């Protein structure tokens, strides 16, 4: 008797293939009458596969009375109601550690792309402009002060890369890390005031929602650069756009947006931003590992074996 | 009696200003009849200021019988005839060490921009394409094999950054460096065969001209990426373009071109290249240091003090 798995959104061709080979795969996003569909399949669905864009909230869990496990194709779990899962005996797994390096790599790539205007330079060459003069001078990365919001796995990986560019490292966390030689700040504003580059690298929770607000942006200031590889709602996005347009923030390298895949179009005209479509973990190598980990958690669950990467 | 200084090309607004304040500045590139001009000023010019695009060859030195010093706004000196300067008692200075970090930073920025398709991603977002689907999966940098051609100051700086991304490092040099823990190869082809990313980081000499030839490119192969932060003539450029067009090379991040600022237009259509207008040292901070070093060498020379950064 084949096991019903509801995949919430089209997150990975490979994963879809691997789930379809093993389970009774339902693709939620293809159903034209989704609530009708959940009623029809209430007794058949035993697992949900989510990602950072679509998870499992209380209403979905309530709608899936035979739900046993939510396996997320993500390290973050802001789209899963953990409290509710625990309350219902539903297991939750994620994909820890396996995307750390790619996300940290992208932070450094964004830094260089903004400070050295790599994307602008490449556009300049392809329109033939180099034949009429050199590109403007840009900004040195090595030696600049890098502030990091969050010093968990991804924040540490960013720090360790930036140290190789001779960047002094500072960070904010709820509590100081005793383990580290970096400079601890007890305030995001004070951190920002003392950073040339500010990197958002923490999970999204109520508490960290809009952790980059207007006051933080203005403290980072006209010669500072914001790097967001976290989540869009970490930033008060309309205030970020205003600050960029008005010269109050020096630049921004953004992988994530508050209402992605919508990106404020005013940003498209700005040479001091780099805008990416949430590609932090988006490599062939890392997505394969993540997909295999989702499958491996589901196979362990339905075979009575300990889970690989449980959270709840 | 003001001292004649011939500046060969328009390399730096700041430097031009600083030379104009101190010396009798001649701007060679503004003269409509240059050979007439050199005749007119043969007795007045005591210094030449060059860069990587225009230096001082034998004919110019012969044309400047009162020449005492050639101060280059560059670390490289391929555009200066050192042999001839030595023969004539002409001093030569350059700008060592001060651009190492920016050039090495740009190599890493090019690597990330190519492998993670940062420029392509940014173009994709700005044309609105994210509303219709996600960007393709790209290639992880961390852990990939980085081969470096040259292990002098810039090559070492590239290596040390790449090690922070967990990249195994290999290099080619005329002789093995006993100092290092990296993997030495005695052949550029063998290096290329064992690299995911191949970085050109050596001076340009006859011997290193076209050190990246078709055989090297094919050994790097369809999944390899070439990074050139050296000089354009390090590569057999028509063979590089063919290899990219035909799928025989995986990608390329290029700061320098054989006939810059001409860039083969066939490259403009390729998504697997990143093309920059020779911006390796092109930051406000580093160019100021370089300019001040040129001025400081000239002031030392004409005041009878030891030079700052002599080569000859």
From Swiss-Prot, chains A, B:
Active site: 231, 260, 278 (proton donor)
Keyword line: NAD, NADP, Nucleotide-binding, Oxidoreductase, Pyruvate
Binding site for NADP(+): 151-154, 173-175, 229, 255
Entry's EC annotation: 1.1.1.237
Annotated GO CC locations: cytosol
PROSITE patterns: D_2_HYDROXYACID_DH_1 (PS00065)
Any Pfam family the entry gives: 2-Hacid_dh
GO molecular function, one term: NAD binding
SUPFAM superfamilies assigned: Formate/glycerate dehydrogenase catalytic domain-like, NAD(P)-binding Rossmann-fold domains
Disulfide-linked positions: none
Enzyme class, broadest EC rank: oxidoreductase
The reaction(s) this protein catalyses: (2R)-2-hydroxy-3-(4-hydroxyphenyl)propanoate + NAD(+) = 3-(4-hydroxyphenyl)pyruvate + NADH + H(+); (2R)-2-hydroxy-3-(4-hydroxyphenyl)propanoate + NADP(+) = 3-(4-hydroxyphenyl)pyruvate + NADPH + H(+); (2R)-3-(3,4-dihydroxyphenyl)lactate + NADP(+) = 3-(3,4-dihydroxyphenyl)pyruvate + NADPH + H(+); (2R)-3-(3,4-dihydroxyphenyl)lactate + NAD(+) = 3-(3,4-dihydroxyphenyl)pyruvate + NADH + H(+)
Biological function: Catalyzes the NAD(P)H-dependent reduction of 4-hydroxyphenylpyruvate to 4-hydroxyphenyllactate and 3,4-dihydroxyphenylpyruvate to 3,4-dihydroxyphenyllactate in the biosynthesis of rosmarinic acid. Rosmarinic acid is an ester of caffeic acid and 3,4-dihydroxyphenyllactic acid. NADP is the preferred substrate.
Family of this protein: Belongs to the D-isomer specific 2-hydroxyacid dehydrogenase family.
Protein name: Hydroxyphenylpyruvate reductase
Organism: Plectranthus scutellarioides
């Amino acid at each position: 008797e084949a096991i019903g798995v509801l995949m919430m959104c089209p997150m990975s061709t490979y994963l879809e293939q691997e789930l379809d080979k093993r389970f009774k795969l339902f693709r939620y996003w293809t159903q034209p009458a989704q609530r009708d569909f959940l009623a029809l399949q209430a007794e058949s669905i035993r697992a949900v596969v989510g990602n950072s864009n679509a998870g499992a909230d209380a209403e979905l869990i309530d709608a899936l009375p035979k739900l046993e496990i939510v396996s997320s194709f993500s390290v973050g779990l802001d789209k899963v109601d953990l409290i509710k899962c625990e309350e219902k005996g539903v297991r939750v797994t994620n994909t820890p550690d396996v995307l750390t390096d790619d996300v940290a790599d992208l932070a450094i790539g964004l830094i260089l792309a903004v400070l050295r205007r790599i994307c602008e330079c490449d556009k300049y060459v392809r329109r033939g402009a180099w034949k009429f003069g050199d590109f403007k001078l840009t900004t040195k990365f090595s030696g600049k002060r890098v502030g990091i919001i969050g010093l968990g796995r991804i924040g540490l990986a960013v720090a360790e890369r930036a140290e190789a560019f001779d960047c002094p490292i500072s960070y904010f966390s709820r509590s100081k890390k005793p383990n580290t030689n970096y400079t601890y700040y007890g305030s995001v504003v004070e951190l920002a005031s003392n950073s040339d580059i500010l990197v958002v690298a923490c999970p999204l929770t109520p508490e960290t929602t809009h952790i980059i607000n207007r006051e933080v942006i203005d403290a980072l200031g006209p010669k500072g650069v914001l790097i967001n590889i976290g989540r869009g709602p970490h930033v008060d996005e309309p205030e970020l756009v205003s600050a960029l347009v008005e010269g109050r923030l020096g630049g921004a390298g953004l992988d994530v947006f508050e209402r992605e895949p919508e990106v404020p179009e005013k940003l498209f005209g700005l040479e001091n931003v780099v805008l990416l479509p949430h590609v932090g973990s988006g490599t062939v190598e890392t997505r394969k590992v993540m997909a295999d980990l989702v499958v491996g958690n589901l196979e362990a669950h339905f075979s009575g074996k300990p889970l690989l990467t449980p959270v709840v």
